[PDB]
Design a protein around this ligand. Structure first.
Ligand SMILES: *[C@@H]1O[C@H](CO[C@@H]2O[C@@H](C)[C@@H](O)[C@@H](O)[C@@H]2O)[C@@H](O[C@@H]2O[C@H](CO)[C@@H](O[C@@H]3O[C@H](CO)[C@@H](O)[C@H](O)[C@@H]3O)[C@H](O)[C@H]2NC(C)=O)[C@H](O)[C@H]1NC(C)=O
Ligand SMILES: C[C@H](CS)C(=O)N1CCC[C@H]1C(=O)O
Ligand SMILES: [Cl-]
Ligand SMILES: [Cl-]
Ligand SMILES: [Zn+2]
Length: 582
């Protein structure tokens, strides 16, 4: 009956609030202080939430979903029918929980040491080396070292992780874990749509790639860069070469039009991690969106502890499922990179606050890409020279191309990377890639999509995917690719709503109530409606589209084409088998 389904959903919501709140606190503690005690209590509260999930999941499966009138109730019960890991038998569930914890801990505590003495952590030590070093061998030491210590140490867990996560997926009606992850977008054409979006960004990426390769040839020498081949993976200023902004100094289009060092300016003007988040909060409220509760400032970990405690430094935002307690956990360094990250995380909080009155089962983004996009949209306006000057962090066509380049190194370079991560994982989950070929197929995709090669030939036992946080942490990655496409669509739509005219990249939406209103109406929908509805609320149309991102970067595309043609660059990497001779 229709009445029994409504009652079930009401009972689910009530009991879920209590249990999910309890789990959130226990998960917070392990992430903020990795010990043996906190690892145990997390696993005990893990079985508690699994107990609830199993109880209500089993009940939900007794309801005939498609023979149910109300669409909101129908949708909730359908989601509760997916038990996820709680579908595993007790022994497999215990093993699976143990593996995830083991992989995450291994990643978190891995260090790279000189035999002399000094041991380096990923953050900030190895990250800093990757960002600042302009010495080929020193970059190699950190690049290889991190893979040797973190990547290699994840390999022993991964095949069993794959087995158990696929099993849980099959027990919930999917064919494998990748199938289950993709289903979050509720879009049959997902794979085709993403491929077309990626293809639309080829002219821009290939031109950026060719230009950067030429600049690296200039700095690192003709003997170490093949102008028709892939770029060695350790030279892009980032451990994973996923964003390239840290090598801006090597690639600046107009060196005679330099801008202020914002990181130096932040440190100069005494910018605290707490000020960085206060500024993000101001931007949201300027748009007419919600301020963070007083409780947020009291309970968030906005900086790496000087206590010397082992933490998960990876930046994340937290919903405690009571509509009052929201937190950010971040090991914040004072720079521009983390100022954008601060807006990114505050975007998650805004989303939490906006949909807090919905049933717990519908308290997520329209799709995972939406949750990731919100903060980045505001950060786009923040990053403009106009806005950076109003923050006293900065003091012509040449400055224009320079700024666009800086943006391109982050936003454009990230496209092929964010695309490839789950292209790899989907093929691991569906069985196309076995443990014999994990690493080799990872590098095939790094070549195919990003046009990169490893500086050092990989050996048996290498598991370079393991050296990227989201792999041992089992966090789906395709959302970041969606985010980067759609955030430019949102920027474009909000800029139109704010009455901005002229080049899209010149837009700053600060204080625009019309912009804030479009985001608010979409964000309040939570997961209650198919994502194209939220897309239509923001942009006036229902599709994902790369046209906004292309429009944003159009002046840079023109510049890159002229510059690359001038030097006769080959677009792409026709000599695709080239690897460093060293
Ligand atoms: C299908 O059912 C949904 C959800 O129903 C809700 O959940 C059920 C399990 C039961 O507990 C119901 O009692 C409960 O309503 C219905 O959506 C709901 O619609 C009403 C409007 O009729 C919304 O109420 C609003 O509440 C705000 C409070 O801030 C007021 O300002 C508004 O004026 C308005 O009264 C309610 O929020 C909404 N619930 C959800 C979860 O979206 C829906 O009406 C129903 N559809 C059909 C076709 O019957
Ligand atoms: C910090 C966020 C998690 S909320 C993240 O993992 N990001 C943000 C963009 C890409 C990806 C990454 O760091 O690899
Ligand atoms: Cl790698
Ligand atoms: Cl995702
Ligand atoms: Zn995020």
């Amino acid at each position: 009956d229709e009445a029994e389904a409504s009652k079930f959903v009401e009972e689910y919501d009530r009991t879920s609030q209590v249990v999910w709140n309890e789990y959130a606190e226990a998960n917070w503690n392990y992430n903020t202080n990795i010990t043996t005690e906190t690892s145990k209590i997390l696993l005990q509260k893990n079985m508690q939430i699994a107990n609830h999930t199993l109880k209500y999941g089993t009940q939900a499966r007794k309801f005939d979903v498609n023979q149910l009138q109300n669409t909101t109730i129908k949708r909730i019960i359908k989601k509760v029918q997916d038990l996820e890991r709680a579908a595993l038998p007790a022994q497999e569930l215990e093993e699976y929980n143990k593996i995830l914890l083991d992989m995450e801990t291994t990643y978190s505590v891995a260090t790279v040491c000189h035999p002399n003495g000094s041991c380096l952590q990923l953050e900030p030590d190895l990250t800093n080396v990757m960002a600042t070093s302009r010495k080929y061998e020193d970059l190699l030491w950190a690049w290889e070292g991190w893979r040797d210590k973190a990547g290699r140490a994840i390999l022993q867990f991964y095949p069993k992780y794959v087995e158990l996560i696929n099993q849980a997926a099959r027990l919930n009606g999917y064919v494998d874990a990748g199938d289950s992850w993709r289903s979050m977008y509720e879009t049959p054409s997902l794979e085709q749509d993403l491929e077309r979006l990626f293809q639309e960004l080829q002219p821009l990426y290939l031109n950026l790639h060719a230009y950067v390769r030429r600049a690296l040839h200039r700095h690192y020498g003709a003997q170490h860069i093949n102008l028709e081949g892939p770029i060695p993976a350790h030279l892009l200023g980032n451990m994973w070469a996923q964003t390239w902004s840290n090598i801006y100094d090597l690639v600046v289009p107009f060196p005679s039009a330099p801008s202020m060092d914002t990181t130096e300016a932040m440190l100069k003007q005494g910018w605290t991690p707490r000020r960085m988040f206060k500024e993000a909060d101001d931007f949201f409220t300027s748009l007419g969106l919600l301020p963070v509760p007083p409780e947020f400032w009291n309970k968030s970990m906005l900086e790496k502890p000087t206590d010397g405690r082992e933490v998960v430094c990876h930046a994340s935002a937290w919903d405690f499922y009571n509509g009052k307690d929201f937190r950010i956990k971040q090991c914040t360094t004072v720079n521009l990179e983390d100022l954008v990250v601060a807006h990114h995380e505050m975007g998650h909080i805004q989303y939490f606050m906006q949909y807090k009155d919905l049933p717990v089962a519908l308290r997520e983004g329209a799709n995972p890409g939406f949750h990731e996009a919100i903060g980045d949209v505001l950060a786009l306006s923040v990053s403009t020279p106009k806005h950076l000057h109003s923050l006293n962090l900065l003091s012509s066509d040449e400055h224009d191309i320079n700024f666009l380049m800086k943006m391109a190194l982050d936003k454009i370079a990230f496209i092929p990377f964010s695309y490839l991560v789950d292209q790899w994982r989907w093929r691991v989950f569906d069985g196309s890639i076995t443990k014999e070929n994990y690493n080799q197929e990872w590098w095939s995709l790094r070549l195919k999509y990003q046009g990169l090669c490893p500086p050092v030939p990989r050996t048996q036992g290498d598991f370079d995917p393991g050296a990227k946080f989201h792999i041992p942490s089992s966090v789906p990655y395709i959302k970041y690719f969606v985010s980067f496409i759609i955030q430019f669509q949102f920027h474009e739509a909000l800029c139109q709503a704010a009455g901005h005219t002229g080049p899209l990249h010149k837009c700053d939406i600060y204080q625009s109530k019309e912009a804030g209103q479009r985001l608010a109406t979409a964000m309040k929908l939570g997961f209650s409606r198919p994502w194209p509805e939220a897309m239509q609320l923001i942009t006036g149309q229902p599709n994902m589209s790369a046209s906004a991102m292309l429009s944003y970067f159009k002046p840079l595309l023109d510049w890159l084409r002229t510059e690359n043609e001038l030097h006769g660059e080959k677009l792409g990497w026709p000599q695709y088998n080239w690897t460093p001779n060293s």
